[PDB]
Design goal:
Two copies of one chain form a homodimer. Chain A is α/β, with parallel strands linked by helices. Chain A has a single domain, classed as TIM Barrel (Alpha-Beta Barrel), CATH 3.20.20. Chain A is built from 17 helices and eight strands. The first copy, chain A, has an eight-stranded parallel beta barrel, surrounded by five helices. In chain A, strand 6, helix 13 and strand 7 form a beta-alpha-beta unit. In chain A, helix 6 runs parallel beside helix 8. The longest helix of chain A has 22 residues. Chains A and B meet through helix 15 of A and helix 15 of B. The structure holds ligand A1BC6 (2 copies). The site of one ligand A1BC6 has 34 residues of chain B, from strand 4, helix 12, strand 7 and helix 15. Chain B: This is Bifunctional protein PutA.
């Protein structure tokens, strides 16, 4: 099981950052016309954002509460991806409870979807670390064989309701295990005809483009239109600190390299909308504007969508969704759970929202101009 | 070996099963029925005041200049301050020396502002040893002691020159031993004689806490220094749990039941309050029940310099507004004031998030509708 696509992923794992960049810079360079139009859109979005000035990140405690609070934005053009927030299960009983929480959430979301299907209707997202009691500490062999039956059962339930089921991306050293899991699922005949299988790839990772080449080819040969959520990445501080402890990082160390990687990978995804459903997860108005223009004038629901986190993205995406704005859909990621189960997620939201490098921090920073906010990362 | 019995007891507690550590803590933490009743009354009053009257709020200022200016208001009210030039986990040798210079310049600025108020009434500084050595948590204790001790001694000399407090913050449990050896060497150094501003944090969620306290009290006696001892419950609980599991340990260095840390804290406070001749106990807590318990445990005789409470800026001022001052409890409180930009502060803010957001934290429970004042004033000695 060492195809040329899989070898390319494994070969990029800790490739020197300096060598990772030129392909990304070239794949991320857009025409002057697209850059100019994206700068104009980005400026307009940012001017709207600056115009109108952890509970905010939790949609509700139960899926029933989250579903009721979602109708308002759903009729404005938003969709949802619900996550029964759990992660880093340390016990078998914890992994079982999270599973039964995901299982019952799928039933509630599936019934609420009511045949809207994978693009117009809500979906679910899961973290594999919630479903295996020693996900980060167990060898991939034993982790695959105990986790695959559980994810399959969830994917079959999502298939039964025709909703999306997305596998979230966590630490860099679990990418390979989750990727072999996605391949087995996309080749499993019990899930045939269902295009709701989803997968996150993190653009701060040096493997991201090769992971996308692998997934694009996997979608094309398997006949599954894989939903690929492109995120920049939530675990940067932790990847750096694990790398320094265990000296080539699996992630970029300059934020701008992640930004270039994201755009490069978005171009690759946008060229493959026949076989994958790109889901561009970002709160960065510049990133959004670039993807919006990179995608061209042709759009239909199901071609691609944007995504955001609940409590972070609605002010930006209220300038995007709907016929009076940009008429592009956005799926809101909806964490569901108690405050205790979501602490680790809120920590990551603190790291994301509080970093001087984050768009969402800079947009409130009176030292940061709009010209700086609309800068094209490749140019910089 | 010097202090062999006390040192062996620390090592012995490191590995002690949690259930074995608890009975002695419970025995020291049990107070009289008249005291428990007074403590419950005081804690009720403190909590009803809090619930009844009321993340950049944790940072006092970006410079020690703005931090020192912002201190006059609550100092006139009777608070004092301990500044930290927010820095930790030096990832480079240049980073350590930079932190050192910022600490050095901060002591000069804090010392000038103190203007001779002394180590109790005037401001002090707190430092994290991980800011002053590159790869502090990774390099050996040979090169740590040999390069950190000269750096902290210089800082301690400057603080002595200005007669201000200099407190060594407590970090991960695996750094406790080297920090304790450092404290001992400084307290025995004649160059620092006559200055009682040397301070040291001990974390009550650690199994070693009462025995570290025995060692420090004993060090205070044989050195002639009146060591300032900041008793905290501990800021790294989630990290310690995760490190112990990843290091493969079968038993943790910290307690795993929050109420065990609460009993540990009260038991350690009792030990400290019986040694105020040779240590200056500094009770860092935002838990009104903990505070009430210590308040009545200390007795009715009080003078500034006997002990103090401490709190973190942005967390403790509402509670200690009900403490400081003749009209309230008439006990002092030193506000810990982090100084810095966004870098290094985010790591502090994460620890504040894990503290302010945990279902077991007092500051979370005080804002939780499902938690009654009854549960909040409950004595952990009795429930354990
Ligand atoms: C489980 C709950 C996982 C969810 N999942 C997810 C799903 C959705 C729908 C969305 C919107 C996000 C996530 N998610 C978080 C995501 O990674 C972050 O939101 C994203 O990184 C933010 O990027 P963006 O809005 O474009 O902001 P910005 O332009 O500010 O970029 C910040 C970004 O840059 C990287 N960074 C910061 N500093 C550096 C340095 N020094 N070097 C390199 N890179 C750097 C960081 O990535 C930072 O976040 C999410 N993340 C994830 O890893 N896996 C998932 O499954 C999700
Ligand atoms: C560098 C900036 C270091 C600062 N230092 C310090 C200095 C001052 C002046 C003050 C006030 C605090 C600290 N500091 C943080 C301190 O440890 C926490 O504030 C403290 O732990 C909070 O406790 P308290 O306010 O009394 O709240 P509460 O009753 O809620 O207890 C919370 C506490 O309980 C422990 N806990 C949580 N969960 C468990 C479980 N399951 N089992 C056992 N124990 C458990 C935790 O300790 C939790 O925080 C500080 N900490 C430090 O370790 N070192 C330092 O130098 C400081």
């Amino acid at each position: 099981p060492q195809s040329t696509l899989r070898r390319a992923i494994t070969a990029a794992y800790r490739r020197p950052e300096t060598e990772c960049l030129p392909p990304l810079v070239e794949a991320a360079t857009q025409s002057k016309e697209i850059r100019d139009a994206a700068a104009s859109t980005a400026r307009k979005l940012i001017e709207a954002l600056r115009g109108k000035h952890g509970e905010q990140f939790v949609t509700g405690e139960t899926i029933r509460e989250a579903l009721k609070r979602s109708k308002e934005l759903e009729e404005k053009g938003f969709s949802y991806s619900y996550d029964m927030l759990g992660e880093a299960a340390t016990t078998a009983a914890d992994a079982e409870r999270y599973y039964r929480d995901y299982e019952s959430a799928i039933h509630a979301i599936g019934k609420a979807s009511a045949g809207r299907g994978i693009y117009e209707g809500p979906g679910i997202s899961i973290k594999l670390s919630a479903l295996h009691p020693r996900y980060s500490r167990a060898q991939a062999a034993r982790v695959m064989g105990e986790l695959l039956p559980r994810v399959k059962a969830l994917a079959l339930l999502a298939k039964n309701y025709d909703i999306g089921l997305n596998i979230d991306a966590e630490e860099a050293d679990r990418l390979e295990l989750s990727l072999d899991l996605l391949e087995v699922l996309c080749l499993d005949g019990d899930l045939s005809g269902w295009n709701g299988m989803g997968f996150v790839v993190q653009a701060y990772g040096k493997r991201c483009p090769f992971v996308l080449d692998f997934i694009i080819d996997l979608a094309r040969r398997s006949g599954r239109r894989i939903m690929v959520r492109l995120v920049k990445g939530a675990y940067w501080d932790a990847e750096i600190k694990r790398a320094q402890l265990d000296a080539d990082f699996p992630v970029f160390t300059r934020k701008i390299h992640t930004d270039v990687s994201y755009i490069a990978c978005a171009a690759k995804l946008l060229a493959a909308t026949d076989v994958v459903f790109p889901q561009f997860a970002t709160h960065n108005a510049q990133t959004l504007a670039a993807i919006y223009h990179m995608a061209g004038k042709d759009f239909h629901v199901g071609k691609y969508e944007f995504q955001c986190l609940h409590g972070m993205g609605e002010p930006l995406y209220e300038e995007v969704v709907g016929r009076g704005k940009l008429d592009r859909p956005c799926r809101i990621y909806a964490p569901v759970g108690t405050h205790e189960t979501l602490l680790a997620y809120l920590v990551r939201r603190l790291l994301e929202n509080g970093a001087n490098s984050s768009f969402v921090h800079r947009i409130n920073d009176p030292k940061v101009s709009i010209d700086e906010l609309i800068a094209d990362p490749v140019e910089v």
